[PDB]
Specification:
Number of helices of chain A: 0
Largest interface: A-B, 9 and 11 residues
Helix content of chain A: under 10%
Oligomer: part of a larger assembly
Protein name (chain A): Major head protein
Chain lengths: 50, 43
């Protein structure tokens, strides 16, 4: 989201147009994904034992 | 004995190239049995 700041000096004059005008865009994040490979292997003969 | 540890990071780079797994199978535990007599003798 954006800043959305607070102000406590809003006492603008009756004739003043604008002091500077302030705006800044929202923030844009970014994430990444990970891999979790997992294997297992011994042999094809032990799997048959009783 | 136990389950395998967590090992923390498990990231990969699209390839296994394993080492025959780290199974490290269970350990075999045993115990022995004894004898109790408590003889009875009537005279």
């Amino acid at each position: 989201d954006a800043l959305a700041s607070v102000d406590g000096n809003n006492a603008h004059v009756e004739g003043s147009r604008a002091e500077d005008g302030e705006m800044k865009p929202t923030v844009i994040k970014s994430n990444v994904t990970q891999i979790l490979r997992k294997v297992v292997r011994v042999s094809d003969t032990a799997n048959t034992t009783a």
